[PDB]
């Protein structure tokens, strides 16, 4: 009956392009319980307030977590032209969203570090003539089409990953380029929160 954020606290978090998504339905949540286990560096919201999101009822609540570095925090804004918002992660404009940047304290041993931060610097589909490039921009809430060709971690900064597309798919290539950022002393993460609406169930409520 209580919304279970446990998968977040155990194991190695993913990267920004292959972010982990938790969908909560029919449960009670304690957002303060979760945020107190971390060192919150940034907390912003759109079409709602940090206090409101923690005290309302919705049809579902969506939480995205991933390894992200603070240095790169400007790139997470939707007013960036950078690779992150173009090819990795874009939040919903139409629905109320929250973006939390936090740091894993040394006490939180259960969350293990990745070797480094990885992201897609570009994602493109080349046509059958191997010349004409159609950039693949991320839609809000959606994964990059290149998550299927990029490893769960970029092996080395500047790597290119590519796969041929079958004639049924119109042929050509799917090509992506990866970048890395050196790992910080404590793991830095990003959390994305989205809430959805429905007329039947508003069974995602704050625990009282």
């Amino acid at each position, epitope marked *: 009956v209580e919304c279970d954020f446990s*998968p977040l606290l155990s*194991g*190695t978090p*993913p990267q920004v392009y*292959n972010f*982990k998504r938790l969908v909560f339905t029919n449960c009670n949540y304690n957002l303060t319980k979760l945020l107190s286990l971390f060192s919150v560096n940034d907390f912003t919201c759109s079409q709602i307030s940090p206090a409101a999101i923690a005290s309302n009822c919705y049809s579902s609540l969506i939480l995205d977590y991933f390894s992200y570095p603070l240095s790169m925090k400007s790139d997470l804004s939707v007013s960036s032209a950078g690779p992150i918002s173009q090819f990795n992660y874009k939040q919903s404009f139409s629905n109320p969203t929250c973006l939390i940047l936090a740091t894993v304290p040394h006490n939180l041993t259960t969350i293990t570090k990745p070797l480094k931060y990885s992201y897609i610097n570009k994602c493109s589909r080349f046509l059958s003539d191997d010349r004409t490039e159609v950039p693949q921009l991320v839609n809000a809430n959606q994964y990059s089409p290149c*998550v*299927s*060709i*990029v*490893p*769960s971690t970029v*092996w*080395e900064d*500047g*790597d*290119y*990953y590519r*796969k*041929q597309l*079958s004639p*049924l798919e119109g042929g050509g290539w799917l090509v992506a380029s990866g970048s890395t950022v050196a790992m910080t002393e404590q793991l830095q993460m990003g959390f994305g929160i989205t809430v959805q609406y429905g007329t039947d169930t508003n069974s995602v409520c704050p625990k009282l």
Partner: antibody
Amino acid sequence: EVKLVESGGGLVKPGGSLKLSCAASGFTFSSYAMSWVRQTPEKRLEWVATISSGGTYTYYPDSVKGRFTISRDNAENTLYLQMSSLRSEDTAMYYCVRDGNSMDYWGQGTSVTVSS
Amino acid sequence: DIQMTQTTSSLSASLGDRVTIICRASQDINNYLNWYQQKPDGTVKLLIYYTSRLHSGVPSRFSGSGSGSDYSLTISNLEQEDIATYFCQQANTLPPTFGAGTKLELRR
């Protein structure tokens, strides 16, 4: 046409050393991560090592860490596996593999036997 | 380390049949699952990468489906050349680990 041709396999005594090679062709070798995978006579597959495209990073399982060294020569288009402190459990068919998000292409393998 | 469990080690089927090999991971591996075919002469090829993507040169009758820790490889309209051992492999974390494989036999 992607080609991977391993060589260097043989009989080696326990506690011994052996260096395997892999001749790559038909693709831009320096653009891909490369891996070694071995198959035991009981047909079980086990990953041995991966090296990044530029040679900067290397990764190994615990069963081989400290004993095996993967390396590459991007000018010569060849992958290497230096083995040392060999045990009889290392007896296997060793495959050169093109890596990435998956193991694309596999060589035909080279046989290694560790025995007195 | 993540354990890959291929629940059946040997499978028997007829030509034209639809075969489904199932792979279980000991953990959520976030679709980083690949399939390999090894023919009796030892030759290994990649069939499917990232759960459902078909490697080039591999016939459409090979397909993949799954999520989390439950994954499947399917061969439809079973042909003679499909006599092989099929391995799954997780590529989510290191070390990448393989299943013990599933041997496919044809009925006669």
